[PDB]
Design an enzyme around this catalytic site. Structure first.
Site, short mmCIF file in Angstrom:
data_model
loop_
_atom_site.label_atom_id
_atom_site.label_comp_id
_atom_site.label_asym_id
_atom_site.label_seq_id
_atom_site.Cartn_x
_atom_site.Cartn_y
_atom_site.Cartn_z
N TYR A 1 0.83 -1.19 0.00
CA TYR A 1 0.00 0.00 0.00
C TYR A 1 0.86 1.23 0.00
O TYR A 1 2.05 1.17 0.29
CB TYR A 1 -0.90 0.07 1.25
CG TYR A 1 -0.13 0.17 2.56
CD1 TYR A 1 0.41 -0.98 3.10
CD2 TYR A 1 0.01 1.38 3.26
CE1 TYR A 1 1.08 -0.94 4.32
CE2 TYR A 1 0.67 1.42 4.49
CZ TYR A 1 1.21 0.25 5.00
OH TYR A 1 1.93 0.21 6.17
N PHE B 1 1.84 9.47 3.53
CA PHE B 1 2.15 9.28 4.93
C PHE B 1 2.61 7.90 5.29
O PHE B 1 3.03 7.75 6.41
CB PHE B 1 1.01 9.70 5.91
CG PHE B 1 -0.24 8.85 5.87
CD1 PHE B 1 -0.24 7.54 6.34
CD2 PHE B 1 -1.38 9.40 5.36
CE1 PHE B 1 -1.38 6.77 6.27
CE2 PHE B 1 -2.50 8.61 5.30
CZ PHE B 1 -2.52 7.30 5.74
N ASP B 2 2.53 6.84 4.52
CA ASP B 2 3.16 5.60 4.93
C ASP B 2 3.14 4.79 3.70
O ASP B 2 2.21 4.97 2.91
CB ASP B 2 2.29 4.82 5.90
CG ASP B 2 3.02 3.58 6.42
OD1 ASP B 2 4.24 3.58 6.53
OD2 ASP B 2 2.34 2.62 6.74
N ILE C 1 -7.24 -0.64 10.05
CA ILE C 1 -8.38 0.23 10.25
C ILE C 1 -9.60 -0.34 9.58
O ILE C 1 -9.55 -0.97 8.54
CB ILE C 1 -8.13 1.69 9.81
CG1 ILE C 1 -7.63 1.76 8.42
CG2 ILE C 1 -7.23 2.48 10.74
CD1 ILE C 1 -7.57 3.20 7.97
N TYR D 1 -9.24 6.99 11.55
CA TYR D 1 -8.71 7.39 12.84
C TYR D 1 -9.54 8.40 13.57
O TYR D 1 -9.00 9.11 14.39
CB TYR D 1 -7.27 7.90 12.74
CG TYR D 1 -6.30 6.83 12.30
CD1 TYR D 1 -6.02 5.78 13.14
CD2 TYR D 1 -5.69 6.91 11.08
CE1 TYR D 1 -5.10 4.83 12.77
CE2 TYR D 1 -4.80 5.94 10.69
CZ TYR D 1 -4.50 4.91 11.54
OH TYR D 1 -3.59 3.94 11.16
N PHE E 1 -6.01 5.52 0.23
CA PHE E 1 -5.02 4.48 0.24
C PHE E 1 -4.96 3.94 -1.12
O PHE E 1 -5.98 3.91 -1.76
CB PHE E 1 -5.34 3.35 1.18
CG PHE E 1 -4.93 3.73 2.58
CD1 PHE E 1 -5.81 4.43 3.41
CD2 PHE E 1 -3.70 3.33 3.07
CE1 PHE E 1 -5.46 4.68 4.71
CE2 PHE E 1 -3.35 3.58 4.37
CZ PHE E 1 -4.24 4.25 5.18
#
Lengths: 107, 107
Positions: B26, B36-37, B56, B82, B99
């Site tokens: 991902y 962010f990741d 999540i 979140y 994502f």
């Protein structure tokens, strides 16, 4: 809320101001004592500008009540940390969180 | 909710069952495209048992709609990721999250 018990008195006189860099060594654990993150482990002090929201509200609000040098025990309720979602795979939902936090210095 | 657009069709026939290990690559980014990741970065597929809440809810619920091989675009609303606290220093409050997720295989 956050609630703060002292483990070590700090100079009793220098308290953090908004904008300052807090340098800290912490350990985070779940309400059952179960550990989940520690700067100590990593041998790296962690640092965050107070005021900037880059740390959980229980830390913004509890580390601001600590004098330089103090080691304190922070209990933070979900609303003051990661709320109802949590952080899956690390913090489960509606977790009260206990932090063992030591204020090393301000910048 | 989570909403799923396809970027690559996957076999169209194998879909994840509860208990299975999803292996994924991902990239996570903020509603403004800001990354962010990424597992891609790290060259490490990420793996999580579907059903176990260790990812999540938007992922539990959106990766379960993907066939093996598929690459899809997931938009996840805060309540499905979140919530209002966010994850300070990474995800700000009430962030809708995009994502880019690829299902490599099931175990």
């Amino acid at each position: 809320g956050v609630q703060v018990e002292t483990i070590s008195p700090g100079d009793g006189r220098t308290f953090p101001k908004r904008g300052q860099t807090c340098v800290v060594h912490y350990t985070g654990m779940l309400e059952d004592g179960k550990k989940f993150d520690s700067s100590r482990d990593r041998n790296k002090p962690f640092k965050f500008v107070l005021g900037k929201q880059e740390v959980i509200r229980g830390w913004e609000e509890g580390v601001a009540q600590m004098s330089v040098g103090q080691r304190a025990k922070l209990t933070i309720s979900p609303d003051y940390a990661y709320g109802a979602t949590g952080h899956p795979g690390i913090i489960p939902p509606n977790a009260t969180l206990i932090f063992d936090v030591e204020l090393l210095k301000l910048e």
